[PDB]
Amino acid sequence: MKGKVVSYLAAKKYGFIQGDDGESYFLHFSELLDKKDEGKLVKGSMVHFDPTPTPKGLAAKAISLPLEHHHHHH
């Protein structure tokens, strides 16, 4: 359910998220709502994703960014 993103590489289209119970999850474009939402991800902070079984076992689904829409203010 909840966890923290420790790494995210767009070139390898594969990142890493550490669950609170120590459960890892896989990051894929098929799991992102939009391709652009990839650049809206926040590295080094909290992220929102839902659990998914999949043949592999651990996987994320429907990634969500509950962080402020505009981090920069003017």
* CATH number reported for the structural domain that contains residue 54 in this entry: 2.40.50.140
Residue 38 CA, chain-centre distance (Å), reads 9
Helix (H) or strand (E) segment spanning residue 9: strand 2-9
Experimental technique used to determine this entry: NMR
User: Structural domain tally of the chain?
Assistant: 1
Spatial distance between the Cα atoms of 3 and 27, rounded to a whole number of angstroms = 13
Whether the CB-CB separation of 4 and 46 falls below 8 Å is answered with yes
Q: Which residue segment(s) compose the domain that 48 sits in? A: 1-74
Of 4, 1, 3, the C-alpha closest to 45 is 4
Whether the CB-CB separation of 37 and 31 falls below 8 Å is answered with no
Tokens of 4: 């923290």
Q: Which residues pair with 9 in a beta bridge?
A: 14
Spatial distance between the Cα atoms of 64 and 61, rounded to a whole number of angstroms = 9
Q: Tokens 């080094």 appear where?
A: 44
Q: Residue 24 phi/psi, 5° resolution? A: -80, 165
**HSE, side-chain direction, 13 A CA sphere, residue 41:** 29
